[PDB]
Amino acid sequence: MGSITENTSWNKEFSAEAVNGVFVLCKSSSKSCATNDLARASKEYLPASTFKIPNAIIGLETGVIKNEHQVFKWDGKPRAMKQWERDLTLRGAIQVSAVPVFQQIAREVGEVRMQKYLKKFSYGNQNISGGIDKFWLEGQLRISAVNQVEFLESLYLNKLSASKENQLIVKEALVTEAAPEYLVHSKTGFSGVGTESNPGVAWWVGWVEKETEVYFFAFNMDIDNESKLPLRKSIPTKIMESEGIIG
Amino acid sequence: SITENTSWNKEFSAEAVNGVFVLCKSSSKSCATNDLARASKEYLPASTFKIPNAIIGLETGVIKNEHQVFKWDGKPRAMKQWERDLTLRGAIQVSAVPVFQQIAREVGEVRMQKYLKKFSYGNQNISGGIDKFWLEGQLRISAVNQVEFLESLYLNKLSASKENQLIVKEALVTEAAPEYLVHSKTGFSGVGTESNPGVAWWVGWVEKETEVYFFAFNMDIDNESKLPLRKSIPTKIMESEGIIG
């Protein structure tokens, strides 16, 4: 990014919901970012299902995922969520955050290749230790909000170390809201409710295309109560609405 | 193969609309329609032509890339919504004719003819002005041919790079929900002349679960107040089939 500046008035939306968290919003043309909290914008947290973005790119690059029309068949064996108990396309698996589909992808990619691509992508602390199918959910991998926006900008510009085709496939799968005047690409994550004195993390990251501008965003918050989960979208939505970008 | 479903006419009769809907599950080899004859009748594509024109612009390099900005020169355009810089998606979404007129001029007649041949696009007749053949010229395409063309695009089987097909696909997203994605494009030739109605279109496809549905709708129109029916009639039919909504 070009610059970052703190805007403490955004804490308004956090205080109203009694949330500890951070929002980073970057405008592409002015190479400028704003955040409610510079310190928290640099703090690093488990990516949880936001990791499906690099995992999908890596799956395609290595040939583990054939293309955007591949169907991931459900075997009929019970899964942790009802929503996952069905055949899924890549978009379907990303959209419902189908953990077991991406655990199998990670296993087939394997540690050496996974390490290589996280280095190429400058993805967080690049620490994948403690189970190839677990690192982004309960392992040692950590990434900051600033690093998420850097990574997403590279994806948007097709500048990651992957084919343009594969970057476009994943970008297509990340669309979550379409309007005549704006398009939103985004991904949620939630690590769980954590333990005593150790909250989980919830994320919403993505980008908005409006007019000829592009805005990259990353939100995270501490969470110890599943009932608070919708705040991961409502707080950043309120901020972007106030900025005139969506709504 | 095209199968008639008489019951779909109820949605047209209610509005006194003359038109056709073609809906195909999985592939263009299995289509349903309210009217066999009109399904294959050819009409001016109007701004549905922005689909092939964007692909051709990318293939020829006239559109340099996914992120090009089409600058407004500050000179009057026929709609205020076109009087601004636009991206490729923005120009498609507001149907910014003058952006695509300049693309067509730079593609040129020789290359435009070549690509419409490769794409099997309607009657492939571009005569009538390189910057207006799809609006007032002799080009004609049917609902069945629109679904075949869209299926090829979906499958990345047009004579174009997969990259360029993917770029145009993203520019066509018009509704995103957890359960389904709609890609689509409208068209409207105008109100026609006496005894010669204009045509309005909505064409596209729906990705739902692991299925895909291709669709094309057209209708005769001679009053702009009827224009919303181009979306509402096919939306009602697709909601009735349980595909969207």
| Tokens describing residue B135 | 């609006």
Min Cα distance B234 → chain A (Å) is: 19
Q: How many CB atoms lie within 10 A of CB B100?
A: 24
Active-site residues of B, by number, are 47
What pairs with residue A203 in β-bridges? A189, A220
C-beta atoms surrounding A5 within 10 Å: 9
Please check if A188 is assigned to a binding site.
yes
Q: Return the beta strands (E) in chain B as ranges.
A: 2-4, 19-25, 31-33, 42-43, 69-70, 86-87, 141-142, 173-177, 180-188, 198-208, 211-221
Check: CB of residue A28 under 8 Å from CB of residue A213.
Answer: yes
Show the domains of chain A with their CATH numbers. 1-247 (3.40.710.10)
How many contacts, defined by CB atoms under 8 Å, are there between A and B? 56
Which structure tokens are listed for A4? Answer: 């970052």
- Alpha carbon of A121 to those of A143, A147, A152, A154, A242: distances in Å? 12, 10, 10, 9, 32
- Of residues B31, B30, B48, the one with CA closest to residue B39: B31
* Residue A159 forms contact with B (CB below 8 Å): no
The CB-side HSE value for A85 (13 A sphere, CA atoms) comes to 7
Strands A175-178 and A182-190 turn out to be antiparallel
Q: Does A97 count as an annotated binding residue?
A: yes
Q: Is A196 exposed, middle or buried (0-12, 13-18, 19+ CB in 10 A)?
A: exposed
The experimental resolution of this structure, in angstroms, equals: 1.4
Q: Is A237 annotated as a binding residue?
A: no
Amino acid letter at A226?
E
Residue that has been written with the tokens 């600058």 in this structure: B71
Q: In chain A, what residues touch B170 (CB-CB under 8 Å)?
A: 168, 171-172, 175
Solved using: X-ray
The per-residue b/e assignment along B170-187, b for 16 or more CB within 10 angstroms, e otherwise, is bbbbbbbeeebbbbbbbb
The response to whether A23 counts as a known ligand-binding position is: no
Identify which of A120, A134, A131 has the alpha carbon closest to the alpha carbon of residue A54. Answer: A120
Burial class (CB in 10 A: 0-12, 13-18, 19+), A44: middle
**Facing residue for A172 by CB, picked from B89, B170, B175:** B170
- Provide the angle, in degrees to the nearest 10, between the axes of the packed helices A52-61 and A111-120: 110
Are the C-beta atoms of B48 and B145 separated by less than 8 Å?
no
Q: Give B90's contacts in chain A (Cβ within 8 Å).
A: 211-212
Tokens of B90: 């923005």
Residue contact B175–A178, C-beta within 8 A: yes
The 3-state secondary structure of A183-222, one letter per residue:
EEEEEEEECCCCECCECEEEEEEEEEEECCEEEEEEEEEE
Residue B242, CA atoms < 13 Å, CB-side half-sphere: 2
Q: What is the dihedral of CA A140, A146, A151, A157, to 10 degrees?
A: 180
Contacts of B94 in chain A (CB under 8 A): 180
When CB atoms are compared, the residue of B94, B166, B209 closest to A168 is B166
Strands A32-35 and A3-6 turn out to be: parallel
Residues of A in contact with B175 (CB under 8 A): 178
Asked if the C-beta of B71 comes within 8 angstroms of chain A's C-beta atoms, the answer is no
Q: Running DSSP on this structure, what letter comes out for residue B46?
A: G
On whether any CB of chain A is under 8 Å from the CB of B162, the answer is yes
Partner B contacted by A197 (CB < 8 A) = no
B17: helix, strand or coil: coil
Best residue in A66, A156, A183 for a mutation probing chain B (most B CBs within 10 Å): A183
Q: Are strands A213-223 and B198-208 parallel, antiparallel or unpaired?
A: unpaired
**Contact across the interface for A168 and B163, Cβ inside 8 Å:** yes
Structure tokens at A130: 């403690």
Strand, coil or helix: what is B73?
Answer: coil
HEC string for B111-177: HHHHHHHHCCCCCCCCCCCCCCHHHHCCCCEEHHHHHHHHHHHHCCCCCCCHHHHHHHHHHCEEEEE
